[PDB]
Each structure stands twice: as C-alpha cells, then as structure tokens.
Design a protein around this nucleic acid. Structure first.
Ligand SMILES: [Mg+2]
Ligand SMILES: [Mg+2]
Ligand SMILES: [Mg+2]
Ligand SMILES: [Mg+2]
Ligand SMILES: [Mg+2]
Ligand SMILES: [Mg+2]
Ligand SMILES: [Mg+2]
Ligand SMILES: [Mg+2]
Ligand SMILES: [Mg+2]
Ligand SMILES: [Mg+2]
Ligand SMILES: [Mg+2]
Ligand SMILES: [Mg+2]
Lengths: 148, 145, 70, 62, 143, 206
RNA sequence: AUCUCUCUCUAUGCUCUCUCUC
RNA sequence: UUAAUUGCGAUAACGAACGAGACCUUAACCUACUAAAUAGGGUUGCUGGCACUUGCCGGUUGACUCUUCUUAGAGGGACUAUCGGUUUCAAGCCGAUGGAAGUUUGAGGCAAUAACAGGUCUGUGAUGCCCUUAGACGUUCUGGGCCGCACGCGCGCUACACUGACGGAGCCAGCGAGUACAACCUUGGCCGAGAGGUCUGGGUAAUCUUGUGAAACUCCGUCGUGCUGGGGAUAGAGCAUUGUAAUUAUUGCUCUUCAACGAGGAAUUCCUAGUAAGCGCAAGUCAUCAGCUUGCGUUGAUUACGUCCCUGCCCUUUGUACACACC
C-alpha cells in the first residue's frame, strides 16, 4: 500500500492552505481528501463553502474536482479536519494553486523510485524529501535549488 | 481435511489445452477458465478421473491432468450420455461432441456462415447485429458495437 | 489478497508462534496480520485444534471464536 | 468542559421544519437558573440533558 | 431410561445413520451416483464425491419414521427448493423425482421401509429397530 | 447447582443456578454502570432478558421505545439494508458473536463495554437545517437523551456495515472491534469519528 | 405594562357558449 | 375542543335534512353455551419398537367420552372504565391501573351537494345522428402485424456478494382453486438423470390432491476481498410438453456461452406498527406461459407522535381592473 504525508510532520496545522479533491456530499459538507496534506478525511461545514449564495452545489464545488481551501480546526490526537473554502482571500488563491502544483510534482517524483524498487515508502520519504523541507520549508523549492 | 503442509512440488500457473490455466483455483474451478469447460461438467469430469476436488490448481500431477484432458476430449466412452455434452446429436456427424477451447466458437461461426448462405431469419439478424431470441428492441440492446 | 492460499511450512511455524500472546484467533485475524488469505486458513485453524494449542469458545460454524490457553 | 441540566417544562415546539423542542432547563448544580434551550428530539420532564454549550441561548427557530 | 428417533437432534443423527450405512455392505447404489444434481431446482451437484445419497436415504428413513403415509411425490416436494431462474423471481421446484424413488427401492431391498395398502410408503419393524439403535449410538456419542 | 430430577433430558447449565439467577444466555446483566448521570429509562439495562429477541409494542407510545433491551436494539439496528430486512435471528446470532469477541479481547463483561460505547459515541451538540430562507444556515441544537442514544446505536451499526462491504472480516468481529474503539482506547472507529465531526460542526455554528 | 425577532428569487401562457314550460 | 359544520358553548335565528358518525364485513378475546369420523383430542383395547416395574413414541374408522384448539351460530365484551392531575372545570385531551384489546381497537365497504365539457359508442341487444351497405368498414377463411428498432421516458424484476453464494441436512404457512354432458386439480406405484410421460384409483369438495412437508429462513460444511464459484443477460446445440399451428428462442428442462453491472448523477416516489422491506404462495388471465396484478400468510426493523418551510387542502378575514376565474 502507498501512503505517507506530503510535508515533514504527521498532522496538519491551523490556518494551512490546502487543495481538496471532492469525494462525496453528505450532510455537513463533503468528506474530502486534502492534497496538500496526506489523504486524511475532513469536512467543509455548510457556511464557509462560498462567499455568496450560489444555490447550486454541483457547479461551483463539483464531485471529483479540486477546490482551493484552508484548514480551520485541527485536533492533534486522532484525526479531524474542520475545513473552509470561503476564508481563502482573493489573490492568495493563485499561491495556493501553485503550492498544490508543487506538491503534485513532488508526489510524482517519489513513486517512480518506489516502482523501480519496492522497499518501505516511509523510509524513502525520509531519505528524499524531509531533511530539505526542514532546512527550508517546501520540497519543491529544494528541488528548484538543486536544478539551479 | 488435510494436515499436509506440502513442500516445493506444486507449480502455479499452468499451460493446459493452449488456454492459460491460473493458480490456486479449486481444480474444477481452475478448469472452468477454459472455454467449453463449465462448472458442473468440469466437476463431473474430475469425478470420472478420480481426483479429489479439494486440491490446488498447481497440486495436480501431469498424469492426472492428461487423464482429465482425455475425459474432456473423448467423453462418450466414460459413461457420459446425451443430457451431458455440448453439441448433442449434431448436424455434421450424428455422434454427439463436447466441443472445447477453440472449437465451439469455430462451430458457431460455421453455423452463422451457413445461415447467411441460406438466408434464414436468425442468420439475417446476426448479420444485422440485432437481438434474435424473442426480444422487443423498443428498449432492449442500446449498448451497440 | 495477493494469492497467499498456501499451507507453507514457514507460514505454519509463524502461525504457531503468533497465535499465542494475541487473545483472539480467527481466519479474518490471520488475513489481517499477513499470513494466509482465505480458504486454507480455516483448514490450518482446524488442524491447530486437535488437542490443546487454542481453546474453542464458539459452538457455531462460519464464524470462529477461539482463545489461546492461559 | 462538561455541563448537564435537568429539564422540567417544555416551552412548546418551534421550527420552520418543526420537530425541534424549546425547553426550560434547570441546573442540578444550583437550581437558581432556568434557561430557554434548544433541544432536538423526544424529551419529557425530569431528564438529564448534557450541554456542550455553556451559556448561549435562542428562542424561536427560523 | 431409553431412546426414540424424535427426541434425538436432527443433523447429528442423520450423519450417524449415513456413517452406519457406509459401514454396511448392502445399499444398492444407482449407476449415476453424484452425476445428478438431486434437484432440477438445483444449479450444482453435491460435494465430497462419496456418499450424500446415503445421507438422503437416511433422511428419507427419518421422515418415514416420523409420519405414516409418505409417497415419492411428497418426498420430492419436501426436498429441492427455489430454482434460480436468474433474472426471474425464484419459484419452488421439487427435487429430482427418480432419485427419491431409487432411494426408497434401496431401502425396501435392505428391508427397512415397506408399503401400506392405502398409498405410499411406511416403516418396517426392522427399520424401526435400526433407527432406535442409531439413536442409542448418538446418545452414547453425546454422553 | 441443585439438579432437578426429570424424565426428560435437561442440560447441566440449565439445572445449575441459572434457575436461581436469571441473567442472560450465560452473561452478567448486573454490574450496572452508566458513566453519565442517570440516563436510565433511556438506556434500559436492569431487566435481565435471556436472549435479545422480544416481540412487543415499542412504537405505540412516545418514550416506550426506551424499555427495549440495548442488545435487542443493537440487533434491530444491524437488521438493515435490502439483503437483511427481517431475519432477526441472524442479527441475534451476530450480537452473540460480537459479545463473545468482546469477552475474548480485553476481557470484561461485554454489556458494560457496549454501554460505554453507546455513551461515548453519541453527540451532545447537533445540527438542524433551520434554513434562514432555506439556505446553508444551521443553528446548534442540543440533543435529547433517547434520540441521542438511538443515533449512537445507528452510527455503531453503520460503522460495522461500512467495514463489512467487501472484506474478509465477518460483520460481528468488526462490530465488536469498532465498539471497543468507541468505548475507550484509540477512538479511530468510524461512528465515533463521525459523531465528533458533527459536534465540531455544531460548535462552529449557531 | 411582558412584547420578544426574522429571512430572498419566481418570466410568460393563445382553445368559444347555453335556456325552457305557469 | 375533536379526525370531523365533532362537540361545548356565545346566540336573528329556530327546528331540520343529508354528509360524517352510527351502520355492515372481517380481524382480534371468549378454557362460557349449542354442536360435531367432512375438525381434532382423551383414556383404553388391537398391535409395532426401545427401556422393561410402572413407561415414552407411534400405527389402526376399535369402542366410548367430551369440545380447549379447528369450524361456526346465538350471544357477551370496551362505554374511555377506574383514579391522578390539567382546561370558562363544560366540551374534551395526555399519563398510570385493570384489561384479549383504550390511535374511532386495526383495516375496509357503502360516500353528500355540486360539477368536470375527465374516461369510454372498443362492455352491450344502452342508444340519437352522419356515413359505408354488396368486388361491404357486415361476415368469415389463409397469411402476416400489434412482439419492428439509431433513440427518449414510465412501471417492475434480477444483481452489484459474506447478514454472501454454493452444497447437504433441519423442517413450519394461511387464501384459494379443482369433473358432466365433459376431458379439471391430480395423489400413490413403476419409466427418465430434468421437464414430463404411464397403468391406476381418490376427489364434481372441511374428507382427495393438500398438513398444499412454500419459500426466505435454521445447522453442518465448501468457498474467501477477486467483476472472482458475485451477476446470468446474450448466444449456440439438444430432449420433451401444450396446441390443427411454435420460425420472429410460447414455455419448460440439460448443456455450454459468461457482458454490462464495485450500491448509482442532479432528481423523486413510498412508509409512523404486525406495519416498511425481505420472502414466498394461491387466485385472475389461462390449452400452453408471471417478471404482472389480486389476495393470503411466514420473517420482521429503524425512526416520529410534531410542525406548517417546500407541495397541497380546509375554513375565517382581507385585496382583487379575474370569472374561459392566475394556466
Ligand atoms: Mg376522570
Ligand atoms: Mg370505520
Ligand atoms: Mg355504433
Ligand atoms: Mg373487397
Ligand atoms: Mg402489445
Ligand atoms: Mg402500476
Ligand atoms: Mg450461481
Ligand atoms: Mg442471489
Ligand atoms: Mg393449514
Ligand atoms: Mg464468474
Ligand atoms: Mg405469448
Ligand atoms: Mg400569470
């Protein structure tokens, strides 16, 4: 099985900007997978999904598609994500998108190696992406630096 | 019930009667993967052979496999009458046959060709790409080719 | 499950040494803790229960309820 | 934080959809307070009602 | 103090009877044992090759012991069940009609099941004795 | 304990003090510990039912639903989704199996564990679609006890159902595991997680 | 003197007609 | 207030009549009465088996004795009864006790006034009127056709599997329906591996089919996260059956063929207790065919006991440049 988080530490932080791929709509909002932090399930409570009343839910959010998001409530014990889409400021959105793209690129890098040789994925993650992140901030930046 | 652990003797994934026979399916249900071979009749064949059904696909020794093949290809001699096999009575020989793997399809094709030659309703339908056995195409068959 | 329907000797040994310490023994449990996956697990369980090893709680088939001796 | 109050009287039932009860909650820790609370579901007199909310109260539901 | 057939658990008893039958030489098996599906309302034939027909015979005997006037048709009705018509809702279809008859014939040959001059089959005294013996054996096995 | 002499054969267990103490099909209906204050006549306990299968009238009054044994209610809840509508015997069997599993794993009287799970899953603060014009506005409403209990039970069953949908794990074992998780230890069970999420949502709203 | 306090878009539509005897 | 123009009461209205209710029909309760080889017992004979000292389980139209269950018939039963409080203490309501039962005890069946330009002349010998009326739109025979298929909806069924499927083996139902001036429901015994044959009898009815030994379920297995033994559509080929006539598989049964289908978008139906759903069965159609309806009966949940937010409805007031009446 393939897993492990995008960033250095296991659990997300408060006011972290994420991109959320929509799985299914229930009652609170949607049990989305955060594509900036692992694949831990969380929800956008029906109040902070859009700035204005837009009536339609499956045209501005859409099942299967990605949404520009921010993490509101985090509980460092087991696994809960109270999430927002509205609290993301104008602009800022572009930055978030860029970050998401970077994350995706990073993910793409870390799977080919695994395919070539199996071996534990956590170990691979440790020896490729994390120290650099710790040194600076994000792995894509490190990659860019390396390229330069 | 078997307490026997078994060492490195059984080789999974077998090439039997041209079509690939996969691993660790329960002999009968391993044989079912081959066209012409079907569940109940496979079971019957196995019984005739006198191999225990509660065994692995790789487990089978070559002799047993050979016997099974023989039973399949020449069915009439081993007490398998009419309410048993594929082409009962038949149109070409008078004898009944339990067609297999790459034979049944060929036979079907031949039949279709003959129908086309002799312009029968069923044949016409087949040529068209339409439903034959009493169906109303008002709703039936919107998947197409 | 990626095959894993073999009563392998090493596997058997593993089962022998991993069924104690853990209180609950079942086919599902075995599948979970990566050894045998499916039909032959049941067989293994049966042949562990001849005299001792793991004590029965269940008087019912399909679902097995077994506890190791304390 | 954990609080719990016994119910004593029901102040009718309010809601656009309805169903949600308006209750008068009395605290078993100091009976000096009788507050108007929103309760979802079947509720009678003399029931211990756990409250995650401490002080916030609302009457009508619209 | 003693034992009878009704007071001993169903499946265990039946299996014991089957075992006894297997042990015994006389049975008069068909030339089509485990070649038939036992029911036309059934999809796949019985498992574990040897026996099963023995088990059915035992069950038939038990049924006969329980009632008085049971024929082939009634027995057939008793066995079988719902035939998977597939796409169409499953109607109750009776078992394979000849198999039951064959079983009855076999029993008659053994001398356990006889006929009554009203219609159908009833138990013989020897048969009853045998059943009682089997019950006793089952009891012994239990405690 | 005290064999009663009959012409008919009766098992030893029945003869023993099961005539004297009437608790379950060989389980303790005593202990009696509800972690929250009172909550009785909402979670039943007390009445020592032998097997969780009673045919009675528990919809024909407002609160009479409470006087259902908790195990029975669990069984009923399990009895859900197409393939299993009716067939309460199956449900009962599954419950028994679950109980056995609980007994095996981390010991204890399973009933108490069940009760704990029921207590610790169910939510204090809930959401209702009040509207504010029919739009996405949900005022935080606190839940009544019986309803809350019912909800908890349902979510527990739902968890089990979710687990079983294409898996090696037979329903009962999975159910037991999730119940244990709910009670205390990990809180990585589905139902409990859902409840917590709901509570969080309620908190962020009014 | 006891109120308590709720909320927004929504456009248009062409096919008849009927009395008695005092 | 009540399900109710249901009451109580205020009273230019008083006394009414429909409607509702009552009423019928059944479903529940009657160890009460009348009764019963066409319904079951009870004891004892007559035997069979195992314990054996009495016994348990049966079989048998042997007597005789009843009637609790099964049938019906007369009847009875609950009327909100009894308190507890609440309400101008009236009308009533919610809770508790007792009760077979307290939602009008559940469900029906009849359903007012007024209509609709609803539906039908394709139920009729119920018909006005117009037409065609002898190469006939009459009539019957032969053969198609309504069953065609690039598509779009509406019902329903089967599934998407472990509470599964597949084997065994447990074993339990209620409505029916069924022969004459014809060819019914079919038992029991032999054929066949199924379907279905076949000589016989029973039954034109509580008796015989049929205790409709029905499924789903119940227990022992086998399989085991796999579009895989889940799914059985589509195709072949063959054996019967009904019919004068089965090709455009009538159906059935055996075989092989194994697709779409990983619980379903926006949407929307149905349901508040023996109910929902699962599961059958019988009947209607029927020569043959149920995925259909109509009635039973098994299995039996979850959540409400409320509000008017959406969708309607009811009355009261209100405003209408609207009565083909907001389309
Ligand atoms: Mg009174
Ligand atoms: Mg009425
Ligand atoms: Mg006319
Ligand atoms: Mg002409
Ligand atoms: Mg038509
Ligand atoms: Mg319809
Ligand atoms: Mg199948
Ligand atoms: Mg199925
Ligand atoms: Mg009956
Ligand atoms: Mg398959
Ligand atoms: Mg037809
Ligand atoms: Mg208008």
């Amino acid at each position: 099985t393939s897993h492990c988080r995008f960033y250095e530490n296991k659990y997300p932080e408060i006011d972290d900007i994420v991109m959320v791929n929509v799985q299914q709509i229930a009652e609170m909002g949607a049990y989305v997978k955060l594509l900036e932090y692992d694949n831990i399930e969380g929800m956008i409570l029906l109040s902070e999904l859009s700035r204005r009343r837009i009536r339609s839910i499956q045209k501005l959010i859409r099942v299967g598609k990605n949404d520009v998001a921010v993490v509101l409530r985090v509980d460092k014990e087991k696994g809960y994500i109270d999430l927002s889409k509205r609290r993301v400021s104008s602009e800022d959105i572009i930055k978030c998108e860029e970050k998401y793209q970077k994350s995706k690129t990073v993910h793409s890098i870390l799977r080919y190696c695994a395919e070539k040789f199996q071996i534990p994925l956590e170990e691979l993650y440790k020896t490729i992406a994390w120290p650099l992140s710790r040194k600076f901030g994000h792995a894509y930046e490190a990659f860019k630096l390396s390229i330069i | 019930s078997l307490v026997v652990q078994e060492q490195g003797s059984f080789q999974h994934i077998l090439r039997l009667l041209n079509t690939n026979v996969d691993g660790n399916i329960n002999v009968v249900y391993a044989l079912t993967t081959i066209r012409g071979v079907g569940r109940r009749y496979a079971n019957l064949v196995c019984k005739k052979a006198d191999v225990d059904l509660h065994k692995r696909a790789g487990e089978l020794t070559q002799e047993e496999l050979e016997r099974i093949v023989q039973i399949m290809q020449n069915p009439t001699h081993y007490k398998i009458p009419a309410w048993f096999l594929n082409r009962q009575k038949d149109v070409n020989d008078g004898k009944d046959y339990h067609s297999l793997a790459n034979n049944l399809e060929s036979k079907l094709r031949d039949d279709l060709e003959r129908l086309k030659k002799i312009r029968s309703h069923r044949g016409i339908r087949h040529f068209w790409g339409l439903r034959v056995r009493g169906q109303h195409t008002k709703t039936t068959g919107r998947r197409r080719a | 499950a990626k095959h894993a329907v073999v009563l392998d000797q090493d596997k058997f040994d593993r089962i022998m040494k991993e069924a104690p310490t853990y209180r609950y023994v079942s086919v599902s449990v075995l599948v979970d803790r990566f050894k045998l996956g499916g039909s032959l697990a049941r067989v293994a369980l049966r042949h562990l229960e001849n005299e001792g090893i793991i004590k029965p709680v269940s008087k019912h088939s399909k679902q097995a309820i077994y506890t190791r001796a304390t | 934080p954990v609080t719990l109050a016994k119910v004593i009287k029901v102040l009718g039932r309010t809601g656009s959809r309805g169903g949600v009860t308006q209750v008068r909650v009395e605290f078993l820790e100091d009976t000096t307070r009788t507050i108007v609370r929103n309760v979802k579901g079947p509720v009678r007199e003399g029931d211990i009602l756990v409250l995650m909310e401490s002080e916030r109260e609302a009457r009508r539901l619209r | 103090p003693g034992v009878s057939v009704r007071d001993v658990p169903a499946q265990d008893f039946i299996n014991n009877y089957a075992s006894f039958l297997q042990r015994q030489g006389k049975l008069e098996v068909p030339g089509y044992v485990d070649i038939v599906k036992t029911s036309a309302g059934n999809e796949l034939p019985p498992q574990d090759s040897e026996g099963w027909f023995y088990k059915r015979a035992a069950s038939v005997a038990r049924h006969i012991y329980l009632r008085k006037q049971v024929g082939v048709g009634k027995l057939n009705k008793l066995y079988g069940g719902a035939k998977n018509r597939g796409v169409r809702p499953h109607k109750h279809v009776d078992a394979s009609g000849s198999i039951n008859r064959k079983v009855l014939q076999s029993l008659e040959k053994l001398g356990v099941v006889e006929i009554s001059p009203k219609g159908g089959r009833r138990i013989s005294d020897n048969g009853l004795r045998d059943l009682d013996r089997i019950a006793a054996a089952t009891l012994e096995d239990e405690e | 304990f005290v064999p009663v002499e009959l012409a008919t054969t009766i098992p030893v267990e029945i003869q023993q003090a099961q005539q004297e103490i009437k608790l379950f099909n060989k389980w303790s209906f005593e202990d009696v510990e509800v972690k929250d204050a009172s909550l009785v006549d909402y979670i039943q306990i007390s009445k020592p039912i032998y097997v969780a299968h009673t045919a009675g009238r528990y919809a024909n009054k407002r609160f009479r639903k409470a006087q259902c044994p908790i195990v029975e209610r669990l069984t009923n809840s399990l009895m859900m989704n197409g393939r299993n509508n009716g067939k309460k015997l199956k449900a009962v069997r599954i419950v028994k199996h679950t109980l056995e599993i609980i007994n095996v794993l981390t010991d204890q009287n399973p009933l108490q564990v069940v009760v704990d799970a029921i207590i610790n899953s169910g939510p204090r603060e809930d959401t209702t679609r009040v509207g504010g014009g029919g739009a996405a506005r949900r005022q935080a409403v606190d839940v009544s006890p019986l309803r809350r209990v019912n909800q908890s039970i349902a979510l527990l069953t739902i968890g089990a159902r979710e687990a079983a949908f294409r898996n090696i794990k037979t329903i009962a074992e999975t159910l037991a595991e999730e119940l244990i998780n709910a009670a205390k230890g990990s809180s990585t069970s589905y139902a409990i997680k859902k409840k917590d999420e709901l509570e969080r949502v309620a908190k962020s709203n009014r």
